[PDB]
Design a protein around this ligand. Sequence first.
Ligand SMILES: [Fe+2]
Ligand SMILES: [Fe+2]
Lengths: 498, 497
Amino acid sequence: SQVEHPAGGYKKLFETVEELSSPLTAHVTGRIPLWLTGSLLRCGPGLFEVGSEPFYHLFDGQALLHKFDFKEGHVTYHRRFIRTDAYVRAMTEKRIVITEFGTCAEVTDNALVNIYPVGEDYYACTETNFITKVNPETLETIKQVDLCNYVSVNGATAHPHIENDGTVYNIGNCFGSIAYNIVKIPPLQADKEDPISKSEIVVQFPCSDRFKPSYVHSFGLTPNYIVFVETPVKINGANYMDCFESNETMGVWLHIADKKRKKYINNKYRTSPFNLFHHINTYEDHEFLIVDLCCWKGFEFVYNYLYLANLRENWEEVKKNARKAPQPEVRRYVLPLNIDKADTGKNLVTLPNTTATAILCSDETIWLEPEVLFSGPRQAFEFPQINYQKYGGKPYTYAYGLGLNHFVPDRLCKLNVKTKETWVWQEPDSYPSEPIFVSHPDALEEDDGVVLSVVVSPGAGQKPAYLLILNAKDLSEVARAEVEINIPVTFHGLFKKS
Amino acid sequence: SQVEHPAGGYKKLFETVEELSSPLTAHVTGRIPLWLTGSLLRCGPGLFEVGSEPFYHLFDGQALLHKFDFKEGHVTYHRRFIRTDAYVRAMTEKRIVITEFGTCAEVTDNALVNIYPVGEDYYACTETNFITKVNPETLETIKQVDLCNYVSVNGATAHPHIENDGTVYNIGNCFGSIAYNIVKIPPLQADKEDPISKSEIVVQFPCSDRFKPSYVHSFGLTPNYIVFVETPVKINANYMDCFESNETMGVWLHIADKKRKKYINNKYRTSPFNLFHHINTYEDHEFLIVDLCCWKGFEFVYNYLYLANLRENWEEVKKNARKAPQPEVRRYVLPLNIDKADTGKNLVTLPNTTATAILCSDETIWLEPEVLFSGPRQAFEFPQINYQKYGGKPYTYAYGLGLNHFVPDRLCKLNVKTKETWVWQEPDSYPSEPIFVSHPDALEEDDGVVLSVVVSPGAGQKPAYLLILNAKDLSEVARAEVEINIPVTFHGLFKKS
Ligand SMILES: [Fe+2]
Ligand SMILES: [Fe+2]
């Protein structure tokens, strides 16, 4: 039954740490596969107060860039704070200078969320117009880039999609009346000029409210389509959180655009209210789009439950605080691309392998019901990853995720989206991070590889943290690389093959 | 993967049979439990045309009453047509005289759906104002009873709830404005006066549409509450011609206080589905747990149940179900206490569910379900539980008939707490709803058997049989085989002796 955490080890995820001057050698137990060569780069908050001035929210602490390097069975660990305007000015003025998502002190450039490649460069990011070029070898900070210099968006998510050729797609709200713009950044060309200088708006999605865009964290992409899910979480001494509100009547509107023709498709897909942070995968199956999502049932903003004061409470209180929260659920939606009026009033989802439905109404809305893939009481399958390079945007079978127990990460999970079978890794008093998949270079199968996760493990005698390596087939442990220092929460990252 | 039925044996479910003059001895294989003593009584259509005039719909064929009797490890089988007005007048005139659900030929009394007890008596029914008293031992027809003689309802469902003392609750629409009335029939008293004569209206549920009641097939009952689910299938020629789907209402859920006989004005709402069968309902702290066999969408599922379509070859049957609503077992959780300080939040604070209920500003309470079972075009339907001991109470197990693009082809058990399932199936065998009988010394909820009637047409095979499975694991315990066909049956009961 229910896994419990009375010792309160999870509080270490939210405790300030010091950066390192140089990389440190981790102590390896088991055997790290010799084909595993490259760097796991991850981002998280690393400084949770400036002197006696606290940051209040999980998404406020100062960006810290982490690196595990793998070479010939050996592992090192390094971390450096990102020298953003937020961090530099805070160090200079010795106070909180720039307003953060949930702390009132100029838009924040605190890139604590993710890192991604553009041409030969790498950028750490949050969700604003500012991204920060960083050196993936040394973790030094290179420069600040303002997306507003190049394209018409107010911000951009921390979850761009990267195509196999290096083309980058993202979404942000804009003044197209409010709208949402898809931005494309090209691959590096022979001239080698900055791909960001060649950014353009591909297509625009309409907004459900003239003056209130929904909060958008991620989106879906296939070879031929772009999918955007417009939730009821709306943006209306203030901080960013103060601007959010819930629309009680709209439910969720889903939108598709033709990627190659750069055209919005006026299909009115609709469903019941949920929050959404992470798309899992999206693909085309006959004339339908399969849309796999990590949902939170309800319209209250899940971020209201992620203040540091609440995440640092003792365990019975953490559980109590999540009692009225939206419930997490992995759902498959299926969107028909062909809408035939002759079928008005019927289920259009004629696929053999799903219980998802899509009902064509007389007013032309298309009401969707999901196929539930995974559902546990206050137990989220979240921070989803797939074999993205080979199966992103395509028919697939496996997803990896971080299991959240009343919002505390405490296990790693694998899901067969076809059969709903699951696998789990967990250890008492250990709190893992998002799992990243690395394929065996010569794999022909989808799940022939490892997953990497950073695990916090406070306790008498124990090494305080470690990089965990699991077999992707069954989440069995292959190795771990232990370090002698704490590592705070990290949200997203990547594995750069070397 | 997909189970296929190319041979097309299911067609025998919809083929006319003759009644019997007296009980046949069935051939036993395995072991009939020695503690099983009594009669399995079931109803279904048994005559699917009158001469050259066809009945069109699965719910039109003339009611046939079936009995398997169990005593000391042996089994007999008997069946007789119910001598309703519809059957008798059809026999007298050698044509279809009374309009049926889906066949235009004066309300039908064709009691082909179910049988239940009232005091010392048994009644076969359909969904109208007419129920037919019948003799459970000989299968003879005794009397037509018009419920309109006793209480104001236009009809009543074929799924009354029956409390342990014999009190019968049912629901039917009435001319309140349209409304829905809960009828209560008391237990037999010391006078032995006909309990129907003492029928009364307990409480009334309001209707979403002033002139259009929803179709109601069943309802929920607990010790303290009555639960009614108002679906988008509306009643605005034959009966089927009067149905329409309301596209924008979704589903409205309703509760009434059973003991205080009071409607509770809580506006529970959710997305559109058809509902035929409640599974079970119970109370858990301040919440009603409502377990349902749903069909996702607002098109009326009965549109897919015309005999011409159910008698097609298997590739065509599958094709015909492509755009049908998808079946899904769902758990909804209804908060009984609504606090306005929680507006905008999930009220379902229970530890063991992912069902939600969000209090909106307009006072509507938007529900999302916990899904318990879901398979593509594969329904868990005709649900049954250990009803005497667990009906209306916290429970763990449900039994059902599995429908494969509307063709019955397997038996299923579901643990509603863990979602574990068990299945019984055999090629070219088409079972009926499974009915649970407790072992006399039962310590656990699933200490017992399920009984199902199975059709198995084929070269060198007995055409039909009573199947007995162990309720613990759905492993086969025995069969009682007969040498004649048995058409589809919908519902029934086991009457202990
Ligand atoms: Fe994210
Ligand atoms: Fe029924």
